[PDB]
Amino acid sequence: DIISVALKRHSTKAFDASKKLTPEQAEQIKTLLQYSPSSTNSQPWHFIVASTEEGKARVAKSAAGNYVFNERKMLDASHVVVFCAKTAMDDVWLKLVVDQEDADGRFATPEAKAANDKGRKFFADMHRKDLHDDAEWMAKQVYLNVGNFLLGVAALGLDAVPIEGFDAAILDAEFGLKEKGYTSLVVVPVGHHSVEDFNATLPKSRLPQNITLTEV
Amino acid sequence: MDIISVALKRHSTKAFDASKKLTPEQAEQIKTLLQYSPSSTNSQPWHFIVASTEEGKARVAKSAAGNYVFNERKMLDASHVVVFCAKTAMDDVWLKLVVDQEDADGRFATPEAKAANDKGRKFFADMHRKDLHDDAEWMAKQVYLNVGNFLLGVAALGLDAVPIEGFDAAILDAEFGLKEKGYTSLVVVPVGHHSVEDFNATLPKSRLPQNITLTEV
Ligand SMILES: Cc1cc2nc3c(=O)[nH]c(=O)nc-3n(C[C@H](O)[C@H](O)[C@H](O)COP(=O)(O)O)c2cc1C
Ligand SMILES: Cc1cc2nc3c(=O)[nH]c(=O)nc-3n(C[C@H](O)[C@H](O)[C@H](O)COP(=O)(O)O)c2cc1C
């Protein structure tokens, strides 16, 4: 029952470090990251999955200054996912995507592949050549991925918290992301909440539909 | 899984069967999904237009013009069509609305707790508006996060859908007078049941391998 899932999930404020993902769950979260949809199947993303003490410590360097309120979450969760966007959309990536779609059997003819490549480049060029918003466009797809992910991990029976409160320059530097062509956007600790998670027992709150939603 | 299966089996529907409508229950449930998405600071910087009448869907479909004409039938034939909109600016009235709703819903034990929450939210809001100069993008990002939640959600309800960026947001904004109301359209998502014309229903799903996209540490 996915509505039950959506209503019962919450942003976890404290994790029980002793409660690890099962081997299975650890693979299933990777599956979720991989299989998110994205505009033109552009998949303009990279994920860091930190499951070791050393790994999580490296990520937690980013919870500095104004962001110390997020350090323990990064340290204490079983697994921590860093969602990264490409910094620019290049033709090598676009060829990578269409070639993969071909390998997977999505095209019956050379003509169908070529039409798919043309359609993808129409959108990619709109953003990188005309609007000059390809960095934002790609970051949007990564956020869509995050939204898919948070509901998915909840449906697996796992706790999570999305985090924008981190220093992306520190995180990028720690993992050499800039030279690799990526930048960190959202950190998502995944695991099981502790009794210290004050948010597990508080009511959820949302604006009423009479403000946010119009039916036509 | 109960959800991995859903993720592996869902697809972007290319054609809908117009006769197959959401049940009243399903129509309620999709509204619940829209409302209950998370967002940075619970800022909820969004508005939704849910078109279910033929006349409503037709108005939305007006945006699929020019380069986007072969997204029109998706928008007309689906049972329900959701227009995801972002706020164009994050005003103090909205920030107060959010914290007052949290207070109404019992999230604060004291006035001091409420004030601390409001202060933290205004901190992030001001950073985006004043220093990063990306407040529009920041809000749009929350809307895209909502879309991701929504696509999985509807798939898990056993409903077909397709996310659509192939539309003219200026036309759509004008049709529904969004600019003046402080909003702009980002993504259109028709929801319903696919038809035999949906060529994508039977094709294998394709993603880049994890050895390219994923690093374990
Ligand atoms: C993109 C994003 C970033 C967020 N950043 C943080 C964060 O840095 N620290 C934190 O504790 N919560 C963070 N949150 C959690 C939000 O406050 C939370 O989603 C919102 O209050 C709604 O509550 P819920 O997630 O329990 O439904 C963030 C949420 C989102 C969607
Ligand atoms: C933000 C976004 C916009 C998209 N726009 C369109 C669109 O305009 N027309 C269309 O047919 N499909 C659209 N798609 C569907 C993508 O092509 C699709 O998600 C991708 O090829 C992966 O396929 P899947 O959704 O079947 O898993 C869009 C998807 C996303 C996430």
Side-chain angles (χ1 to χ4, degrees):
Chain A
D1 186 329
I2 200 70
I3 300 303
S4 186
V5 175
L7 290 168
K8 293 170 79 46
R9 61 152 296 288
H10 76 286
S11 287
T12 297
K13 301 295 176 172
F15 291 83
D16 184 340
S18 77
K19 291 175 90 173
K20 304 292 195 163
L21 270 64
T22 62
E24 182 59 36
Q25 286 172 329
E27 278 298 329
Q28 292 174 136
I29 68 170
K30 298 192 289 173
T31 298
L32 288 168
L33 295 169
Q34 175 174 210
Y35 278 90
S36 179
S38 59
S39 184
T40 75
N41 205 24
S42 58
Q43 301 166 79
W45 52 47
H46 195 81
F47 317 103
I48 303 160
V49 180
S51 63
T52 65
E53 287 303 311
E54 184 195 324
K56 289 185 283 192
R58 289 176 67 192
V59 175
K61 294 194 176 180
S62 69
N66 292 315
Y67 306 128
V68 295
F69 77 102
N70 289 321
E71 193 186 19
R72 284 253 59 79
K73 293 156 190 145
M74 294 186 191
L75 260 15
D76 295 337
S78 173
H79 280 59
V80 179
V81 185
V82 187
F83 289 74
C84 308
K86 287 173 58 54
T87 55
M89 183 55 84
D90 53 292
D91 282 1
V92 171
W93 196 259
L94 296 177
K95 184 176 196 293
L96 190 74
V97 170
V98 73
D99 283 349
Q100 180 63 52
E101 286 193 338
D102 193 16
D104 289 325
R106 291 184 56 84
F107 308 126
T109 65
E111 287 78 354
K113 180 169 187 181
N116 181 271
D117 181 66
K118 183 169 73 168
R120 184 167 299 98
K121 282 174 191 265
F122 173 82
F123 282 88
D125 293 343
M126 186 177 295
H127 294 288
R128 71 195 174 168
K129 298 189 179 297
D130 306 339
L131 298 170
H132 299 285
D133 77 340
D134 70 329
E136 175 159 0
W137 180 49
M138 293 180 291
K140 289 164 169 176
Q141 315 306 314
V142 175
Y143 271 74
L144 192 148
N145 196 318
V146 173
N148 178 269
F149 189 75
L150 296 171
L151 189 59
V153 302
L156 294 174
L158 297 167
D159 283 315
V161 58
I163 299 176
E164 267 173 6
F166 72 98
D167 192 321
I170 291 174
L171 196 48
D172 285 3
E174 177 57 30
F175 287 90
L177 296 183
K178 191 177 291 171
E179 181 272 336
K180 297 169 197 296
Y182 301 98
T183 188
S184 56
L185 299 178
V186 184
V187 180
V188 181
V190 183
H192 296 282
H193 76 271
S194 62
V195 297
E196 280 55 45
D197 182 5
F198 67 81
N199 206 33
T201 61
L202 286 181
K204 192 166 294 311
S205 176
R206 295 293 189 281
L207 295 180
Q209 293 178 23
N210 64 26
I211 292 174
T212 63
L213 194 152
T214 299
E215 289 170 300
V216 297
Chain B
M1 192 53 159
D2 194 46
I3 198 66
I4 303 299
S5 297
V6 173
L8 292 174
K9 292 175 82 180
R10 64 152 295 288
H11 80 287
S12 287
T13 293
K14 300 290 166 169
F16 290 88
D17 181 348
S19 66
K20 294 191 176 163
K21 303 296 178 194
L22 269 59
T23 58
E25 183 197 11
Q26 287 170 330
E28 194 63 65
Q29 288 179 134
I30 66 168
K31 292 193 291 181
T32 303
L33 287 170
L34 298 161
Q35 174 172 28
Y36 279 97
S37 178
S39 64
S40 179
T41 77
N42 204 25
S43 60
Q44 306 164 75
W46 51 46
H47 197 85
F48 315 101
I49 306 166
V50 179
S52 61
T53 71
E54 299 306 284
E55 185 200 322
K57 288 186 279 161
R59 291 177 69 193
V60 178
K62 279 182 179 146
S63 71
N67 295 147
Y68 309 123
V69 61
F70 297 112
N71 282 321
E72 281 192 64
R73 284 251 61 87
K74 291 168 188 116
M75 302 189 186
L76 295 150
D77 294 332
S79 179
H80 282 61
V81 175
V82 179
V83 184
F84 284 79
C85 312
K87 288 174 64 57
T88 52
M90 177 56 70
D91 48 285
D92 281 2
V93 167
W94 198 261
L95 297 170
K96 189 189 195 284
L97 196 74
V98 168
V99 71
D100 286 343
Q101 184 64 56
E102 289 194 327
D103 188 27
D105 283 327
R107 293 187 52 84
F108 307 121
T110 61
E112 14 288 283
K114 179 175 188 188
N117 181 270
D118 179 71
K119 170 177 200 82
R121 186 169 299 97
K122 176 67 165 169
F123 176 90
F124 279 94
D126 283 348
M127 178 176 78
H128 290 287
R129 180 175 60 89
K130 294 169 67 64
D131 303 330
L132 301 169
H133 302 97
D134 72 343
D135 50 307
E137 170 178 5
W138 177 50
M139 293 183 291
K141 278 161 161 177
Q142 317 309 311
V143 173
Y144 269 79
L145 190 153
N146 197 137
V147 176
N149 180 267
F150 188 79
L151 295 172
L152 191 58
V154 300
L157 289 171
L159 294 172
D160 283 312
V162 53
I164 298 184
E165 274 175 359
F167 73 96
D168 189 321
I171 291 169
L172 197 42
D173 283 4
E175 181 58 33
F176 290 90
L178 298 184
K179 185 168 178 194
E180 292 65 45
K181 296 164 177 172
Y183 300 94
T184 188
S185 59
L186 294 177
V187 185
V188 178
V189 180
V191 182
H193 297 276
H194 77 272
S195 61
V196 304
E197 305 286 337
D198 179 11
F199 61 81
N200 201 28
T202 51
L203 291 171
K205 188 170 293 311
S206 179
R207 299 287 189 281
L208 299 174
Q210 294 178 203
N211 52 69
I212 296 188
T213 61
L214 200 148
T215 300
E216 298 172 293
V217 302

